[PDB]
């Protein structure tokens, strides 16, 4: 029991049949919002109930409504790893660049939770790989910091920039170097990440690097 509305609880707990009959009794239940401004669709997305989502979508429920924290059903599905729901939601016009109250797009959640298949769906459905959250950080910054190498490859394939600075002036390369993500930093540099950009403490990625990484990257770009 997660919501003050029964339809939300039914959607959450996967009870499609009891949900259909509830809606047959009162159609407005399909889009009635709970205390959190969530409807059945949000909660079906959170729990991964694919068939409930496809039922609600074929009813004609709005697909882009945000709850009281700004999360759209695409946010919830992308972040919980629901591949099939993401796909259905994209097919019904889910907005790939929607942002929540924390400033994140669904791609932000996909990048930092390593949802490779979902990341590709969002990117081929037109997500801006360079969208920035409230700290001017991109999906690449998140992938870089956590050492998510495959995700970096995906973002680069879809032409994500490597040199965008966050509010502290860090690029994804500073973040890789600081967090000791050696192979990610080598990859970034191989695909054009600048070793020259200074952050707000006036340090380049090389001055952030621990160990011997700084020298290895310097040789990669020049000699």
Swiss-Prot record:
Lineage: superkingdom: Eukaryota
Stored Gene3D superfamilies: Ankyrin repeat-containing domain (1.25.40.20)
Region of interest (Interaction with RB1), ranges: 1-68, 168-223
ANK repeat windows: 1-33, 34-66, 67-99, 100-132, 133-165, 166-198, 199-223
Short name of one Pfam family: Ank_2
Molecular function as annotated in GO: RNA polymerase II-specific DNA-binding transcription factor binding; transcription factor binding
UniProt region (Interaction with RELA), positions on chain: 36-223
Database matches in InterPro entries: Ank_repeat_dom-contain_49, Ankyrin_rpt, Ankyrin_rpt-contain_sf
Renumbered residue ranges of the record's region Required for nuclear localization: 1-34
Keywords of this entry: ANK repeat, Apoptosis, Chaperone, Cytoplasm, Nucleus, Repeat
Tissue: Tends to be up-regulated in cancer cells with RAS mutations, including lung cancers and adenocarconimas (at protein level).
Compartments reported by the entry: Cytoplasm; Nucleus
GO BP term, example: positive regulation of protein ubiquitination
A GO cellular component entry from the record: cytoskeleton
Keyword Chaperone: yes
Subunit structure: Part of transient complex containing PSMD10, PSMC4, PSMC5 and PAAF1 formed during the assembly of the 26S proteasome. Stays associated throughout the assembly of the PA700/19S RC and is released upon association with the 20S core. Interacts with PSMC4. Interacts with RB1. Interacts with CDK4. Interacts with MDM2. Interacts with RELA. Associates with a CDK4:CCND2 serine/threonine kinase complex. Interacts with ARHGDIA and increases the interaction between ARHGDIA and RHOA, hence promotes ARHGDIA inactivation of RHOA and ROCK.
Protein function: Acts as a chaperone during the assembly of the 26S proteasome, specifically of the PA700/19S regulatory complex (RC). In the initial step of the base subcomplex assembly is part of an intermediate PSMD10:PSMC4:PSMC5:PAAF1 module which probably assembles with a PSMD5:PSMC2:PSMC1:PSMD2 module. Independently of the proteasome, regulates EGF-induced AKT activation through inhibition of the RHOA/ROCK/PTEN pathway, leading to prolonged AKT activation. Plays an important role in RAS-induced tumorigenesis.
Protein known as: 26S proteasome non-ATPase regulatory subunit 10
């Amino acid at each position: 029991c997660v919501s003050n509305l029964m339809v939300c609880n039914l959607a959450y707990s996967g009870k499609l049949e009891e949900l259909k009959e509830s809606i047959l009794a009162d159609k407005s239940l399909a889009t009635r919002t709970d205390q959190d401004s969530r409807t059945a669709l949000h909660w079906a997305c959170s729990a991964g109930h694919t068939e409930i989502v496809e039922f609600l979508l074929q009813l004609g429920v709005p697909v882009n409504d945000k709850d009281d924290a700004g999360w759209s059903p695409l946010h919830i599905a992308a972040s919980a790893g629901r591949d099939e729901i993401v796909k259905a939601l994209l097919g019904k016009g889910a907005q790939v660049n929607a942002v929540n109250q924390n400033g994140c797009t669904p791609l932000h959640y996909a990048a930092s939770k390593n949802r490779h298949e979902i990341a590709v769906m969002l990117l081929e459905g037109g997500a801006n790989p360079d969208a920035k959250d409230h700290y001017e950080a991109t999906a690449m910054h998140r992938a870089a910091a956590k050492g998510n190498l495959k995700m970096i490859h995906i973002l680069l394939y879809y032409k994500a920039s490597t040199n965008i600075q966050d509010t502290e002036g860090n690029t994804p390369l500073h973040l890789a170097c600081d967090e000791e993500r050696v192979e990610e930093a080598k990859l970034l540099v191989s695909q054009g990440a600048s070793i020259y950009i200074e952050n707000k403490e006036e340090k380049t990625p090389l001055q952030v690097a621990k160990g011997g990484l700084g020298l290895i990257l310097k040789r990669m770009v020049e000699g």
